[PDB]
Every structure is written in structure tokens, then in C-alpha cells.
């Protein structure tokens, strides 16, 4: 069929694609349009990457539903350990597999703009735009990355239904993926690392899946962000260096089964009155040392609530940070820090720390239960609105 | 390898795949079976079908193992929103990527069947089928879809084990996926939306796994059905807009991380004596207004359990439905209704509605344990046998 | 481009790859070196596998970053069923799909190694090799499998990041994948049955994702063994026949959303010092009589910890073993065994047993807590020196 196309073969290009493979899928996108005519004639096309290191030179723009753009795989190498290391005798010193060197020379950051002007009512939404297996790389940076090279990899900026990122490599970017008005988009089994941020979902979003990823990028940015979220589902990812879960303003999340790590605080945020949020089954462990920030201070949280009615269950909240590096100094850590709002609640939780830790439940809080998930000793209560059901400890008494 | 096909491009097919790919598909099998002819030379075949509209006139039946049909992609597009839609200026108005058009005309109702004839003992059961990334459509149907058009993507409907059904859209269809007597089927990272029931294991299933879909049928069907299933594993869906999975004499599912949403009651409905499930890191939410239907009222439950020994722990429970629109009508909704059953299990949950809302115990039930899961206010115990250790209020 | 190679189709084959596939590989791997020759031209390649039946008779040895070997699919059969049934008239008896019969003559026992040797610092560590829906089979074995035929599937033996073993299927062999100095590999949607031990993960790792697999090895084996594990995330797995998980000095895991079955002890064994990792929202099954062994007797524990500071919460574990069968006879069976360490925690957990069955404190542990995890009669503390809120009863 005249739907399958593959860079490195297709010979309508009129540049390399190891020159400017940006070129050359703006091309083919340009042949898919002059075959695919009208409203009922646009099954999309499918672009094959091959094995091989391309220079992205000219920005993609993608307004095709349909479109898949597939490699060989996610080529991830650690340009970070590279790049502290002595490599002449390295055997391979650049990322591989399907392999885009992220290298705008046309005034624009990212390397994959996924956009489409009107009213979606009118014209109708990008639908189930497909990124699989293949690599895209900043080529060079310096931690934390951002504002770092400045470079994206893939920026969705009108709404769309169904998109999908799968099976990935994401490298030395300031933003791996960012998507504006999302709907029902899957982030699934994907290597983003050494980043500044990793997942954005902006403006709004419903329903987004994000699973089964490794989410890898450092301390100035978020692993997830997402701004107007509902019903968010984020299960079975490791999220490691400086987990950074951030919700402004959404509700019916479901993040659970994850293994989270951080050297700083902030692993989960629900800022900005986010509520009905469950964290549940989640290992969080906060340790110290890769790298430094003063971004948030200890009393921030591994966990911070600023919202209603949210469910904090069945976790593990493992803190080991020196006593000498935490701040503000001589100060208890923070676990849990329940900053505003009413009714939410934590229950069977398990916390244990190098230093005695605290939840945090603010003066303004209410109706906040803690059951077995805090002993007495790990609850600093500043108001007397709250229900405890003390995690059992020894010696209540002095005497 | 000549085991390799792409349905636009081989040469054997006297039909065209994009009048009916399934009649080139058959003529593939047809083809494979004419070339792998004993029992130790049938390691199976691949086809490809491109991006493209194809219409599927004729129903394919596959009793080869070791078939991968495979696709550029999931291809969905909302044929509901276009049908409530002034689509005139639409760039596209059609699902797509490998885009198949179920439009039987042989008075059959499924896309294709998956069924070898004889005793699995003697003939062996399919074994890894593959369907992966492609698009299966109804073209045209109406909410809540079932009966509506009766057509149904893929069935299964011979014993079979290690089956594959991933990546996959399914849209405007009656029943997304059936499969019947299965054993070790992976159902994973599906697109299945705007169906009536969207995946169905019949008869009986041992060890399913349902991971990392998106289940958005209607409120006439199930997300997911299974009866007599043992040992299902469901984690990591997003089922939403009438979330129903119900377990009919079901044990041992393990139903954890899923995030869970419907406009009706009966999201997890454990029935026929369905024993020995955990439900675990769940967010349910009910909502209403996107449908409506009479199939359950309130009372029914966000969770219904008739079973024994089950167990529920670490789910929230989201519940905001108008007082006006509760049924019955000024009655106190139920969060989850232990129907029948011994030895339940109900812990570190969080219940949150927008009414007063209740855990019943009917007067059947024994030894059901409700712990730090409800407050004195959210339980309505109808016997004295059970155990409850309130949530603090 | 020329970075992509069919095993059928390379015309710088000078063995037929269904006589010798290693060979056949191995060449590839040779031309990909002469074609890729300095540290900034070494992109890799894609070594794809068409569906067929192809013996191995040589091992590959991989020591190039980003090669993605690829198949049609996981091709998985029942030898085991094969093996006890009567197969004259069975359409197929071989397992499929793009299917390598592992049978080597060259001195070794892997179908696949993967190993650079030297140090990482000097040379590179091996990056994002990819195996993907392919099927590696042992051919002929006898359970338990272990040291059984002696076969290996796949064995990363140096240092190695990203790896990914995805939609395979292993069977029949002694050990299907084992990773040794594994930094974020990604073990995802694979199906490993009927075999000795179906993941190894061996001198040390970082953050391993194990993710949506079927693993089925059997009794004499592990189904996850890991020794010096930093933050493994175990998850949405169906682990089956002899689940059994084994860290050793194995810490900060996340085994959260498993369905978890054996008809053994030792599901989950944290051992030598195994601290701060959670077990969360899984479903156990203990079961009796697909195989026996004595390998453990029933006091080991469906769980069992030796380590500090452990979290098991929101889980089931559900116990049914004749009493005729339950070691040392006449004996309580253990749920759970703390048999060393300090402050582990348990909360929330629902056990079933159709036999009185215990969560034991070692004498020896400290500061155990017990929270709506036992019944008064369901725990035996063989040490003052822990905390109990009893399940009530
Ligand atoms: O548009 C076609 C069709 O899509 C449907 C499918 O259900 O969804 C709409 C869609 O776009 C909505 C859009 O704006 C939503 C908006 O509100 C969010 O944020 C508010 C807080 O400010 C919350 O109170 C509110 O509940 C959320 O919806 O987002 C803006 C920023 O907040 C608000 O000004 C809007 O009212 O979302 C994007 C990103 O903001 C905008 O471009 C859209 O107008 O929803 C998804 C994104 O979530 C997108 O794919 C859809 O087009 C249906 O409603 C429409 O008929
Ligand atoms: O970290 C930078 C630097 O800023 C300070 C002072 O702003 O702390 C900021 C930080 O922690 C603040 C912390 O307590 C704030 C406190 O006061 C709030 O509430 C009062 C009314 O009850 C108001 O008068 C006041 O304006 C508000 O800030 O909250 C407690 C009552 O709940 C009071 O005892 C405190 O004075 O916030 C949490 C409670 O929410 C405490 O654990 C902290 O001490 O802000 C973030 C947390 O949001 C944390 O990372 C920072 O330390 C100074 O303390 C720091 O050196
Ligand atoms: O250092 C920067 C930063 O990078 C991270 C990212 O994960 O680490 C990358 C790095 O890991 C080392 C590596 O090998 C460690 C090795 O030895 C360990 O285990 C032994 C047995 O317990 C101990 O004797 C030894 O002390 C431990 O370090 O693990 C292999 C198996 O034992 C041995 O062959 C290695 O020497 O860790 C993984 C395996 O866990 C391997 O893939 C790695 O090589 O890798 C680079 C290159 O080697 C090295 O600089 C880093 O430490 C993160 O941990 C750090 O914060
Ligand atoms: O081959 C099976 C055969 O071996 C025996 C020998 O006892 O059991 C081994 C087995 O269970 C042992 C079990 O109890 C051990 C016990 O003693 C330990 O602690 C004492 C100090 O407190 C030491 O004097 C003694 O040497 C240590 O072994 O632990 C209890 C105190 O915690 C004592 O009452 C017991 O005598 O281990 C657990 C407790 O950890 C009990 O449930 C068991 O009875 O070892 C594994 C468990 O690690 C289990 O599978 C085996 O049965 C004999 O009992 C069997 O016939
Ligand atoms: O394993 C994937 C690779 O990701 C890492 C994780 O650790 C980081 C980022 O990428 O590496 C730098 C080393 O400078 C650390 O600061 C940061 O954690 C690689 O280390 C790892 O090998
Ligand atoms: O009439 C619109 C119908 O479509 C819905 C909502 O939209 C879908 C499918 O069904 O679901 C998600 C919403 O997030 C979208 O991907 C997809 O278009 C029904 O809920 C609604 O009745
Ligand atoms: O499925 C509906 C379609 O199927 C047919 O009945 C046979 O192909 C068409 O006449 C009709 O439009």
C-alpha cells in the first residue's frame, strides 16, 4: 500500500534524512495530504525509522490523525554518566536505535509539533496519533536541564483524542513530552531519563493513562505535571532521581502501584485544591545526595495536599537524608503535609525514617484521618480538627 | 520468509482487501494451510494490513495457531461525538490507521471467529494467536449499542491458550471481544470505546490477564464479563463512562490499580457465588447524566457482593449523584451492598458522596468484617453478624 | 537502510538460519561491525525473525548496544500437555510463531549471551539491546525442568542498561532470562512457562521493571530471583504453578498488583537482610498437588521475611492444603513468617485458610506490628516484643 513509508527508502525526500530527517517526514506528511483528500479518505500512514543517527534540522508539524512514526526502539544510552566519564575507549558514546539528534536550526525548540488550528467542534480533534520505538536526544546538556538546551521532543498543542507514546527513548531534553488538552492519551513503556521534565499535560486533560514508563528527569522540572486533570490514572511506573508528581487542580486521579524516588522533596504534589485523588500501594523512598536543590525545603512534603477528600493507603514512606542536610535546619522532616482542605484521609501507611518524621496536618485542615498510618510521635497536629487512630508505639507515659 | 503477508500486497488474492479483507484473509489461511501441512510444520504466519479503509464483507474464520494479524495502530476516532456533530468541515469523519469496516453480508455477526472443530484433547487447543494494533468498526450504531448493530469484532469459540489481543481499537460494535474457553489470554493496551460490551470471557477462563486498556462500553453491556473465571487478574485499566466488570461465579481475581468510573451503579459486581477476590488500590467513581438507564437503581451498589471471603481494601470511593436523580427516589445510596456471603472482607477504604451513603450488610451475610471502611453513619448492618471497627467520626 | 536484516532474506548468509539461527545471527552481528566501526557510527541494528521453525545450534554472543531482535509473536505451546496427552492427531505439537529450538552443539548451554567484557568505565556498558515477540524453546524437558535440560534462554553477563525483554515467550528450558549487573531493565508482557526459573537477576541490580508478564516456572526454581536488588518494581504480573519472588539483600522493592499463585511455600521470600520494600495489593493462592516438593515445608511462610522495616498491606492471602498434606505433619501452616528483623509492618491483610494457619514472630524479631492483619487466633508471637490490633473475632 502507498501508506507505509520508511525514511531512509522513500525517494520523493529531497534531503537526507540523516541530514534533516525533519525534512523529510514533513515531506512525506506533505504526500500523505496530496493522496488523502477528503473527509472519508484519511486512514493516516505509517513512517518506519530505521536503525541509524539522524539529524532533526527543521521542526515536524503534524495535523494528521492516524499518523504512526515507528523505530526499532528506544536507543537510550546515559549521556549523563557519559559525560562524567572517560570515554575514549567507550565502545559506542551516543544513544541508538531509531536515533533523532534534536538539532533546530529554524527558530523552534521542539522537534515534533502535533497541532491543528479551529474549533475542534468544527474541524475535528487530532485522533490516535501513534510514537513508538524510536529515540529522540538533545544531544548535549547539563543538569538539571531546565531551562537546560531548551530542546522538546514531542509537543501535542491542540486537542486530541486517543494519542499514544509507546515504547520510547527520550534523552537530554528539556521536555520530553508535552500535551495540551488531552484526551484519553496513553503514555505507556517508555525510557525518559536525563530530562528536565518528563510528561506535561497542559491546559486540561481527561483521562490519560500513564503506565509501565521509567520517568527519570531531574530536580527543576516534574516527572508528571498536569493542569486541570481529571480522572488521571498513573500506575506501574518507576519514577526515580527526582520524582515529581504535580496536580494543579485535578481531581479523580488513581496513582497507584509505582515505585517513586526522589533526592528531593515533592514527590507527590496535589496543589491548587486537587481533590478525590487516591495514592494507593505505592513504594516512596526520599534519599539524598544526586544532585542538590533548594527548590522545596524539607517541610514541603514527600507528599503535599492542598485539596479535599484525597486517600492516601496501603504505601510505604521510606526517608533516609542526613541531619545535616536537611532544611530549614534542625528541623523535622516532613512525610505528609496536609496544607489545606477538608475530609482526606491516610490509612495504613507505613513510615519509617533515618530521623523522626512527621505528618503535617495545618492549622487550616479538617476532618483529616490518620489511621495506623502515623504513631504519636510522627504527627505534628496543629489542629485539634482531625481523627487519629495512632499506629502503635511504646511508653505514652513518663512514670 | 513466505509465511509473511502484507493483505495489499500479495499476489495470491482475487478480491481486493479494501472491498473485502475478509475474504483476502481467508484466501491467506487458506494459502498458509495449503504450505504448513503436518503437525510439526505449521509454526503459523504473519499478516500485515497498512493504513488504510478496508471493508470486511465476508466473516473470517482462523483455526491456524500461531496467527498474527497486525496493524498500524489503533486508529479511534469518537463516532459518537461525530454523530451528535456538524461534521461538514471535519478534516476526518472516519476511525483509521488500519482501518477494518465490519459490514458482513454473509448473515454472519462477527468481524472474525476464532474456532478449530474437535475435542481439544485430540486436536490440541489454538494456541497464541496474535491480533495486534489494527482498528475493528461498526461503522454506524446507537447508544447503548447493545443489541444495536449486533456485530461483534473478534470471537473466540474453541478452547484456546496463550492468545494475544493487544494495542487493538475497537469502536461501534455490539461485543468488542469474546472469547470463550480460554486459558492464559493477555488482553492488553486495547483502545475499546462507544461498544456495547467491550470484552467478554465465556463459558470459562482460567488465568486471564486484562492490564493497561481503556474499556468504555455502554450501560447495556460489560466492560469486562467473565464467568467462570479462575484466577483473572484485571490492574492498570481506565474503564470508564459505565464501568461494569461482574465476576459470575468468579474466585481468585486479583482486581488492583485500575481507575474505575461509571454513570450507573454495579462498577464491580461479584456474583453466583464469586469468592476469594480481592479488590485493591481501585479509585471508583460514580458520577450520572452521560446515559441514562434503569437496568439497577442505587441500591444495587458501587461494588455487589454475593460470595464469600472476599476482600476490599485500599479503594476510594467517589460518589456525586443529584438527590433528584437517586433511585429509588429519597432513599440512601449504597457504596457496596454485601448481598450474600461469609467472611468478607472490607478495610482502609475511604467513602466519599455528596448524599448520605451506606455499606449494607444484608441479613444473610455472615462474619463480614468492615474496618476502618465506613463510618457508624455509612454502615446499614441488617444482621448482628459482622464485625465492625468504625471509621472515626 | 541496511541496519535492517531479515534472517531469510540476508543475502550474506552462508548458513541456512532454519539449520543453524545462531549462525545465521551471529553473521549479522559480524557485518553490522564491519559497517559500524567507531563510537559515534554505531547505531545498531534490527535483526527481525519471520514466523518459522529454526534450530539454534550455535550461541549468539551479543556485545553490540541497541540491537533489537524481533518476531511475529510469543508462539507459545503446552509441552507439558503435550507431553502427558495423546498428540496423533493434534493440527500442531511444536510451539510457534517465530520459533528458535534451542539446541546447541557448540560447547554451551544459551541460546543467547550477552556480554562485553571489561570494565564498564573503560569500554561502555551494553545499552537498550531489545528482544521482542520472539519464541525461545528447550524442545524436550521433564519437570520440574531444573537443572533439567540445562538450557538458557537469554544471559546478559556484564554490566548492561535499558535493557528490554518484551512479548516474548520462553518454554521448556532451565532458565529462561537471566540479567546479571542490570541497571532499569524492562521485563514487560512476556510469556515464560514451563520452565526451571523464568527471571534471574543476578550479582546486583538497579530499579529492574518486571511488569505484565505471565511467569510459570516451576517448583525447583524461582519465578524472580534477585540478589542485591536496589528499588526492583514488581507489578501486574500473574505469576503461576510455583510463584515464588526471591530477593536476597534485595531493597526498597515495590511488588504491588500481582496475582501471585503456587502450589508451594515461599511466594515471597525477603532474605539476608531484605529491608524497606512493600508488598502491596497483591492476591496469593496457595494451592496443593500440580507437583510436590519438600523443598519448603509449610512453616517457611507464604511470605517470608528476614529483614527490617517491611510493609505488607491490603493484600490476600488465601491457603487451602489437605491436612494430610501440610508440613511438619500435624502443624499449624504459616501465612506469614517474620523470622528475623526489626519493625516490619503489616496492615490490612484478609487471610483465608480451610486449616488454622498462623502469622509467626520469630523470637528474635522486634517491634513487629500486626494491624487488621490476623485474628487473636491467627497469630503466634513467639516474642513479647511486637504490636497487635487484632482483626476481630
Ligand atoms: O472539544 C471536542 C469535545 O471534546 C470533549 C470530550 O469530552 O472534551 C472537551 C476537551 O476540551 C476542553 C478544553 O477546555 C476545557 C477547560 O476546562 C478545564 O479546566 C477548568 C479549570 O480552569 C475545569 O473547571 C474544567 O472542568 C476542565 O474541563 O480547560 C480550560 C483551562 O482550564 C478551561 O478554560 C476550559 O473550560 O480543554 C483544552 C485544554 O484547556 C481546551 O483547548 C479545550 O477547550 O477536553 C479535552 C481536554 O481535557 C480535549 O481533548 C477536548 O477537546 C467535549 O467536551 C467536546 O464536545
Ligand atoms: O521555607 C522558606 C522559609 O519560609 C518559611 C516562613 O514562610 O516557611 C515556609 C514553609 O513552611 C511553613 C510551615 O508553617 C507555616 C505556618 O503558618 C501558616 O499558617 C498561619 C495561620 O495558622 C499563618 O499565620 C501563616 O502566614 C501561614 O504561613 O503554618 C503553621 C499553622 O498551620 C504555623 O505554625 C506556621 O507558622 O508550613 C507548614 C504548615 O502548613 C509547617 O510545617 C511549616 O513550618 O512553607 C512550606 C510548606 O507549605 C515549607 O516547605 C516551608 O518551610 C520559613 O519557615 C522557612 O525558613
Ligand atoms: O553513579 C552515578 C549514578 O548512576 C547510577 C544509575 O543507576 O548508577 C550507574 C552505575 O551503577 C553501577 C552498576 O554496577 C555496580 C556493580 O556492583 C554493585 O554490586 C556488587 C555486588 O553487590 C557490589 O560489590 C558493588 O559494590 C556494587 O556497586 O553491579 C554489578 C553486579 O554486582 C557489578 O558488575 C558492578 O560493579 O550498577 C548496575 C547493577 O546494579 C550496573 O549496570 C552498573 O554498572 O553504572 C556506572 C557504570 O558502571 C557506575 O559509574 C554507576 O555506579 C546511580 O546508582 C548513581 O547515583
Ligand atoms: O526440616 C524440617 C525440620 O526442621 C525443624 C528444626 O526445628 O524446623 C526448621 C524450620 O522451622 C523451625 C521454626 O522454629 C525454629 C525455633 O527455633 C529457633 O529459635 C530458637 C531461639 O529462639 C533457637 O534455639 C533454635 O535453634 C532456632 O532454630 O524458632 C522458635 C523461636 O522463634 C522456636 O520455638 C523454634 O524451635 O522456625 C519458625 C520460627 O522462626 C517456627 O515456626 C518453626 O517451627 O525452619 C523453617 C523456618 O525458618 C521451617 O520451614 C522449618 O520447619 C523441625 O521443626 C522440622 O521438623
Ligand atoms: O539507567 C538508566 C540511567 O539513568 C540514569 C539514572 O541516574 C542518573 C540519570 O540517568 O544518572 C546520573 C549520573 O550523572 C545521575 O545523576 C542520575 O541519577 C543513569 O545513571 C542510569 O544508568
Ligand atoms: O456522546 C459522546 C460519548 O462518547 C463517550 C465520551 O468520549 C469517549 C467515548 O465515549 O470517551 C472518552 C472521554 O474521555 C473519549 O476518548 C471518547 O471520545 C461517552 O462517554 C459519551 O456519551
Ligand atoms: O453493515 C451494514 C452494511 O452491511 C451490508 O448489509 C452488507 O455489506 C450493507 O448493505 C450495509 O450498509
Known amino acids: 500500500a502507498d501508506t507505509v513509508y520508511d525514511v531512509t527508502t522513500w525517494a520523493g525526500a529531497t534531503v537526507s534524512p540523516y541530514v534533516d530527517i525533519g525534512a523529510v517526514i514533513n515531506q512525506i506528511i506533505a504526500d500523505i495530504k496530496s493522496k488523502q483528500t477528503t473527509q472519508t479518505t484519511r486512514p493516516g500512514a505509517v513512517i518506519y525509522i530505521p536503525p541509524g543517527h539522524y539529524d532533526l534540522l527543521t521542526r515536524v508539524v503534524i495535523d494528521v490523525s492516524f499518523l504512526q512514526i515507528k523505530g526499532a526502539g528506544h536507543g537510550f544510552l546515559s549521556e549523563a554518566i557519559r559525560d562524567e566519564s572517560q570515554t575514549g575507549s567507550w565502545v559506542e558514546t551516543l544513544p541508538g536505535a531509531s536515533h533523532i539528534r534534536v538539532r533546530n536550526n529554524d527558530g523552534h525548540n521542539e522537534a515534533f509539533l502535533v497541532s491543528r488550528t479551529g474549533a475542534p467542534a468544527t474541524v475535528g480533534r487530532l485522533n490516535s496519533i501513534v510514537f513508538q520505538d524510536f529515540c529522540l536526544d538533545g544531544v548535549n546538556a547539563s543538569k538539571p536541564y531546565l531551562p537546560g538546551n531548551g530542546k522538546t521532543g514531542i509537543s501535542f498543542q491542540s486537542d486530541n483524542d486517543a494519542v499514544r507514546i509507546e515504547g520510547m527513548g527520550f534523552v537530554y531534553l528539556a521536555h520530553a513530552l508535552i500535551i495540551k488538552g488531552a484526551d484519553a492519551p496513553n503514555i505507556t513503556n517508555n525510557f525518559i531519563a536525563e530530562c528536565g521534565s518528563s510528561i506535561e499535560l497542559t491546559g486540561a486533560s481527561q483521562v490519560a493513562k500513564i503506565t509501565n514508563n521509567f520517568l527519570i528527569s531531574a530536580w527543576a522540572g516534574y516527572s508528571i505535571f498536569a493542569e486541570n486533570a481529571e480522572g488521571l490514572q498513573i500506575s506501574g511506573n518507576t519514577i526515580l532521581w527526582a520524582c515529581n ?106 513510615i519509617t525514617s533515618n530521623v523522626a518524621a512527621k505528618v503535617v496536618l495545618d492549622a487550616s485542615t479538617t476532618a483529616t484521618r490518620v489511621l495506623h498510618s502515623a504513631t504519636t510521635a510522627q504527627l505534628d497536629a496543629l489542629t485539634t480538627n482531625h481523627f487519629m487512630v495512632a499506629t502503635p508505639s511504646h511508653h505514652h507515659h513518663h512514670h
Open 245 to 350: 508528581i504535580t496536580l494543579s487542580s485535578g481531581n479523580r486521579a488513581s496513582i497507584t502501584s509505582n515505585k517513586l524516588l526522589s533526592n528531593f522533596p515533592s514527590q507527590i504534589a496535589l496543589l491548587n485544591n486537587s481533590s478525590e485523588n487516591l495514592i494507593s500501594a505505592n513504594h516512596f523512598r526520599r534519599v539524598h545526595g544526586d544532585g542538590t536543590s533548594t527548590r522545596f525545603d524539607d517541610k514541603f512534603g514527600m507528599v503535599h495536599i492542598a485539596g479535599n477528600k484525597n486517600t492516601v493507603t496501603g504505601n510505604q514512606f521510606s526517608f533516609d537524608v542526613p541531619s545535616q542536610n536537611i532544611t530549614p535546619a534542625g528541623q523535622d522532616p516532613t512525610i505528609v503535609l496536609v496544607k489545606s482542605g477538608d475530609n482526606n484521609y491516610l490509612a495504613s501507611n507505613h
